[PDB]
């Protein structure tokens, strides 16, 4: 089997920067009758299926923007993004389509750098339908922030609670390059109704004081 | 590109078999090679094999020889991938793809999630999340939708079918105690909601669909 | 080469399907008087094939191929002059290569031993997946 090796594992570029990623095959991919190197580059955006960016080492697939440039020959190939865009956020895979089994590289991760952005925080008490079935989830959405690191604290009646908290970060946003995060604190209905004030506090380098979102059951 | 449409996600017991389909639209499947590729969670791509449907001619990665069988029906413009004696390692997304003579995969389907487990399907509870009771009126309003207690992955979540896409953040599933839970938020201008309805649509490819969860202001 | 540009072919001089070539092979249906008011109809005729077309970038098909009522292969296509997009006039992409279709072997029996392979072609923003049959004669 032809071993394809990519480098580096990940890249972090801001919009407009030029970037290059490398792929190397264990064996030449050249057809002498064609003078063509059977190497292809695929792009996979978060949550999406791969799309063919380049084939034959340098032939851009129709519809792909000019900023994508494939080059190389023999066993050494490169993919260049002459001006990285926000929508170029993706994993990139090389693949020899020379001989079977067709084999892929491990991929190169392209993340995007941007200016700092403060999170917009919204808090949601348990729905009536969830309370009817004996559970109670309090949800905190912290949307459109950068950089990715953020700390969330849950306060019940002004006292920090640890158990029952589940967090999840999105992938980077493909348009403004921000992150979003969701924090869910799940209780029994009885635990929930035995307290009044529920608070979700965000610590982010975008401010020296935590952004606080709270509600009282009244 | 050309249009490939793959069948829905599946749960398979260990040691059982699965058969996924891939239907072509807008072209004759006899004029392309159909390849099958897999991708394990947070991993890379792996070629399984390919068929020429004009004559049924198949090639495979020999490590899949026997375990995988690729077939094709040009009557219904559909290719098929059957996998036998599945293990937990085989849990993955399976893509179908088209190629011409070059064998470069120029178009890919959306993928079919296959989960190998002895546990069995649990449809999720879907909860609408309206803003806090008596919140101040801003220029924008954020609504939520909580999909809790399902297995296996994935669920497909949309807002007002496909028409509300900007302002949506769907958060990746988190596994707590053998079940998955995810959430989704949508932000619109205040003059949009609740003057016109906003509805959370959740499908769990174990043949469950709850659109019923319209977002209603709290009382 | 194609003998002449595509015109109106009354249905009964045709035996079998009329294949026209947008890059992807297509079968053309007939048309009655309500669909061709300017054609000088005869009381013998009821249905005709309207094969008039410029090149598919702006027209419908590069050319068409069918069989005479007497059993003779007839073809029509655009006037002779991105290989085939400016000078195509039927199923022939090049002098050695034609587009495969279920009736290629009857219309063109001399192409029995041509090698076939799958290609793709973009025309007017639409992708066409084709099979091509090729190679020489002495
Ligand atoms: C379609 O093509 C046919 C060719 O058979 C055209 O018919 C001829 O048109 C010319 C010019 O009007 C006449 O001088 C001929 O007498 C017609 N008949 C023949 C047999 O040549 C027809 O006009 C075309 N129609 C359109 C809409 O372009």
Q: Which of A50, A106, A169 is closest, CB to CB, to B108?
A: A50
| Number of neighbouring beta carbons within 10 Å of residue C29 | 11
Measured CA to CA, the distance from residue C88 to residue C90 in angstroms comes to 6
Compute the distance between CA of residue B183 and CA of residue B166 in angstroms, rounded to an integer. 16
CB contact at 8 A, B23 and B78: yes
**Residue ranges of the domains in chain C?**
1-138
Cα separation, B82 vs A187, whole angstroms: 43
Beta carbons of B105 and A52 less than 8 Å apart: yes
Cα-to-chain-centroid distance, residue B178: 20
Which residues of chain B have a CB within 8 Å of the CB of C119?
Answer: 100-101
Number of B/C CB contacts below 8 angstroms equals 30
- Nearest CA among C107, B104, C6, C24 for reference residue A54: B104
Query: In this complex, do A104 and B129 lie within 8 Å of one another by their Cβ atoms?
Result: no
Chain B residues within 8 A of A126 when measuring between CB atoms: 127
Closest partner CB to B103 (pick from A102, A124, A127):
A102
Q: Which residue of B has its CA nearest to C23?
A: B27
Asked how this structure was determined, the answer is X-ray
Count of CB atoms within 10 A of residue C30's CB? Answer: 16
Write a three-state SS string for A120-162.
EEEEECCCHHHHHCCEEEEEEEEEEEECCCCEEEEEECCEEEC
- B45 near A CB under 8 A: yes
Biggest CA-to-CA distance, chain B: 67
- Residue matched to tokens 């921000």: A178
**What is the C-alpha separation between A53 and A48, in angstroms, rounded?**
14
Domain check: are A135 and A100 in the same one? no
How many C-beta neighbours within 10 Å does residue B58 have?
Answer: 16
Residue C57 structure tokens: 């970038």
Q: Contact A94/A39 with Cβ under 8 angstroms?
A: yes
C121 lines ligand 1 (CB under 6 A): no
For residue A93 the two structure tokens come to 């895979």
- How many Cβ atoms from other residues are within 10 Å of residue C50's Cβ? 17
Please give, rounded to a whole number of angstroms, the shortest distance from the CA of A93 to a CA of chain B.
8
Between CA B83 and CA B68 the distance in angstroms is 5
Nearest by CB to C118, from B1, B2, B100: name it. Answer: B100
Using CA atoms of B6, A63, A105, B63 in order, give the dihedral in degrees to the nearest 10.
Answer: 30
The single residue listed with the structure tokens 């084709």 is C130
Q: How far is B146 from A12, CA to CA, in rounded Å? A: 32
The answer to whether A139 and A213 have CB atoms below 8 angstroms apart is no
Q: Which of A113, A142, A158 is the last residue of a domain?
A: A113
Question: C133: which strand partners?
Answer: C98, C116
B66 by Cβ neighbours in 10 Å (0-12 / 13-18 / 19+) ranks as exposed
**Same domain, residue pair A43 and A131:** no
CB–CB contact B47 A181 (8 Å) = no
Cα–Cα nearest to B42, from B173, B201, B183, B180 = B173
Q: B151: closest CA among B114, B203, B206?
A: B206
Instruction: Give me the residues of A, 103-162, that contact B with CB < 8 A.
Output: 103-107, 120, 122-127, 129-130, 133, 135, 137, 139, 141, 143
Are C107 and C63 a contacting pair, CB within 8 Å?
Answer: no
A168 with B174: Cβ contact below 8 A: yes
Q: How far apart are CA C89 and CA B145, in angstroms?
A: 58
Q: What angle do CA A47, A48, A54 make, to 5 degrees?
A: 140
- The distance from CA C99 to its chain's CA centroid, rounded to whole angstroms, is 10
CB pairs under 8 A between A and B: 134
CB-based contact B217:B134 (threshold 8 Å): no
Chain A: nearest CA to B129, how far in angstroms?
6
Cα B105 to Cα B33: distance, rounded to the nearest angstrom: 9
Asked if residue A128 and residue A83 are part of one domain, the reply reads no
From residue B78, alpha-carbon distances to B3, B98, B124, C116 in Å are: 12, 12, 31, 22
**CB B149, CB B124: distance < 8 Å:** yes
Selection from B157, B160, B161, B159 nearest residue B171 by Cα: B157
* C-beta of residue A97 within 8 angstroms of C-beta of residue A36: no
Tell me, what CATH number does A57's domain have? 2.60.40.10
**In the listed set A53, A80, A113, which residue is the last one of a domain according to the structure?**
A113
Terminal Cα-to-Cα distance of chain B (whole angstroms): 50
Show the tokens assigned to C42. 């005869």
Find, among A192, A71, A74, the residue nearest to A127 by Cα: A192
Domain boundary among A113, A138, A170: A113
The answer, for C121 touching chain B at a CB cutoff of 8 Å, is no
N- to C-terminal Cα separation, chain A = 67
Tell me how many domains chain A contains: 2
DSSP secondary structure string for all residues of A161-173: E-TTEEEEEPPPP
In whole angstroms, what separates CA A132 from the centre of its chain?
Answer: 36
Task: List, in order of start, the domains of chain B with CATH numbers.
Answer: 3-116 (2.60.40.10), 125-215 (2.60.40.10)
Under 8 Å between Cβ of C67 and C92: no
Would residue A128 be called left, alpha or beta, if left means φ above 0 and alpha means ψ between -120 and 50 degrees? alpha
The token pair that represents A2 in the structure block: 């032809």
C71 contacts C78 by C-beta, under 8 angstroms? no
**Ligand 1 pocket check for C46: Cβ under 6 Å:** no
C134 touches chain B (CB under 8 A): no
- Strand ranges in C24-114 using DSSP code E only, listed in sequence order: 25-27, 48-50, 63-67, 73-77, 92-94, 97-99
**Which subunits count as partners of chain A given 3+ CB pairs below 8 Å?**
B
Give the C-alpha separation, A137 to A143, whole Å.
Answer: 19
DSSP string for residues in A181-218: EEEEEEEEHHHHHT--EEEEEEE-TT-SS-EEEEEE--
CA distances for B145 relative to A178, B162, B175, B186, angstroms:
21, 15, 17, 9
**CB B141 within 8 Å of CB B190:** yes
The two structure tokens encoding residue A108: 């190169």
Q: Chain A within 8 Å of B95 (Cβ-Cβ)?
A: yes
Contacts 24+ apart (CB under 8 A), C89-92: C89/C1, C89/C2, C89/C62, C89/C63, C90/C2, C90/C21, C90/C62, C90/C63, C90/C64, C90/C65, C91/C19, C91/C21, C91/C25, C91/C63, C91/C65
CB atoms within 10 A of CB B135: 14
Identify which of C19, C48, C43 has the alpha carbon closest to the alpha carbon of residue C31: C48
Contacting subunits of B (3+ beta carbon pairs below 8 A)? A, C
Q: Name residues whose C-beta falls within 8 Å of residue B19's C-beta, 6 or more positions apart in sequence.
A: B80, B81, B82, B83
Q: Report residue C48 as tokens.
A: 């005709």
Do A76 and A131 reside in the same domain of the chain?
A: no
- Contact B96/B22 with Cβ under 8 angstroms? yes
Which of helix, strand or coil describes residue C76?
strand
C-alpha A199/C-alpha A140 separation (Å) is 9
CA distance B48 to C57: 38
Judge if A8 and A83 occupy the same domain.
yes
Q: Do C129 and B28 touch (CB under 8 A)?
A: yes
Instruction: Decide: A107 and A7 in contact? Cβ < 8 Å.
Output: no
Tell me the chain B residues in contact with residue A133 when contact means C-beta distances shorter than 8 Å. 125
| C129 with B101: Cβ contact below 8 A | no
Residues 6+ apart with CB under 8 A from C10: C45, C47, C48, C49
Contact (Cβ atoms closer than 8 angstroms) between residue C25 and residue C63: no
Q: Are the CB atoms for A24 and A3 separated by under 8 Å?
A: no
3-state secondary structure of A9: coil
Query: Do B127 and A49 lie within an 8 Å CB cutoff?
Result: no
Closest partner residue to C117 (CB to CB) among B28, B30, B101 is B101
The residue segments making up the domain with residue A91 are 4-113
CB distance B10 to B20 below 8 Å? yes
Q: Could you give the 3-state DSSP secondary structure of residue C110?
A: helix
Q: What is the 3-state secondary structure (H, E, C) of chain B?
A: CCEEEECCCEEECCCCCEEEEEEEECCCHHHCEEEEEEECCCCCEEEEEEEECCCCEEEECHHHECCEEEEEECCCCEEEEEECCCCHHHCEEEEEEEECCCCCCCEECCCEEEEECCCCCECCEEEEECCCCCCCCCCEEEEEEEEEEEECCCCEEEECCCCCCCCEEEEEEEECCCCEEEEEEEEEECCCCCCCCCEEEEEECCCEEEEEEECCCCC
Structure tokens at C73: 């292969």
> Is the beta carbon of C7 within 6 A of some atom in ligand 1?
yes
Question: What's the CA gap between B178 and B193, in Å, rounded?
Answer: 36
């Amino acid at each position: 089997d032809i071993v394809m090796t990519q480098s580096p594992s990940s890249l972090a570029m801001s919009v407009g920067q030029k970037v290059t990623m490398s792929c190397k095959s264990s064996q030449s991919l050249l057809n002498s009758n064609n003078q063509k190197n059977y190497l292809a580059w695929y792009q996979q955006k978060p949550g999406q299926s791969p799309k063919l960016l380049v084939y034959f080492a340098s032939t851009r697939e129709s519809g792909v923007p000019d900023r994508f440039i494939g080059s190389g020959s023999g066993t050494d190939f490169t993919l260049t993004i002459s001006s990285v865009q926000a929508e170029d956020l993706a994993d990139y895979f090389c693949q020899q389509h020379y001989s079977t089994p067709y084999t892929f590289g491990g991929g190169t991760k392209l993340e995007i750098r941007r200016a700092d952005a403060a999170p917009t925080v919204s808090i949601f008490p348990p729905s009536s339908e969830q309370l009817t079935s004996g559970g109670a989830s309090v949800v905190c959405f912290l949307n459109n922030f950068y950089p990715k690191d953020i700390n969330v604290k849950w306060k019940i009646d002004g006292s920090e609670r640890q158990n029952g908290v589940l967090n999840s970060w999105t992938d980077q946003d493909s348009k403004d390059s921000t992150y979003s995060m969701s924090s869910t604190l799940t209780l029994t209905k009885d635990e929930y109704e035995r307290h009044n004030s529920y608070t979700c506090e965000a610590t982010h380098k975008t401010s020296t004081s935590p952004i606080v979102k709270s509600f009282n059951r009244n | 590109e050309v249009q490939l449409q793959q069948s829905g996600a599946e749960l398979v017991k260990p040691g059982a078999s699965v058969k996924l389909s891939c239907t072509a639209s807008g072209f004759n499947i006899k004029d392309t090679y159909i390849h099958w590729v897999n991708q394990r969670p947070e991993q890379g791509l792996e070629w399984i094999g390919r068929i020429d449907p004009a004559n049924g001619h198949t090639q495979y990665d020999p490590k899949f020889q026997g375990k995988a069988t690729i077939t094709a029906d040009t009557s219904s413009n559909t290719a098929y991938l059957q996998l036998s004696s599945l293990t937990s390692e085989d849990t993955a997304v399976y893509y179908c793809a088209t190629s011409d003579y070059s064998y470069a995969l120029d178009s890919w389907g959306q993928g079919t999630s296959v989960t190998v487990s002895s546990a069995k399907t649990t449809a999720p509870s879907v909860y609408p999340l309206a803003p806090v009771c008596g919140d101040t009126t801003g220029s924008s309003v954020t609504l939520g939708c909580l999909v809790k207690g399902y297995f296996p992955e994935p669920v497909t979540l949309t807002w007002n079918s496909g028409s509300l896409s900007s302002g949506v953040h769907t958060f990746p599933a988190v596994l707590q105690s053998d079940l998955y839970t995810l959430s989704s938020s949508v932000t619109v201008t205040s003059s949009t909601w609740p003057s016109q309805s906003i509805t959370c649509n959740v499908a769990h490819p174990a043949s469950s669909t709850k659109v019923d969860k319209k977002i209603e202001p709290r009382g | 080469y194609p003998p002449r540009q595509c015109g109106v072919v009354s249905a009964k001089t045709v035996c079998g399907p009329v294949y026209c070539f947008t890059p992807s092979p297509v079968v053309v249906g007939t048309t009655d008087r309500l669909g061709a008011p300017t054609y000088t109809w005869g009381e013998n005729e009821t249905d005709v094939f309207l094969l008039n077309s410029t090149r598919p970038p702006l027209g419908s098909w590069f050319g068409c191929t069918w069989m005479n009522s007497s059993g003779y292969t007839k073809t029509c296509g655009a006037p002779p002059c991105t290989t085939y997009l400016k000078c195509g006039s039927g199923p022939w992409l090049t002098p050695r290569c034609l587009i495969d279709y279920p009736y290629r072997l009857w219309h063109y029996p001399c192409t029995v031993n041509y090698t076939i392979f799958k290609i793709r072609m973009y025309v007017g923003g639409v992708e066409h997946r084709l099979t091509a049959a090729c190679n020489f004669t002495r």
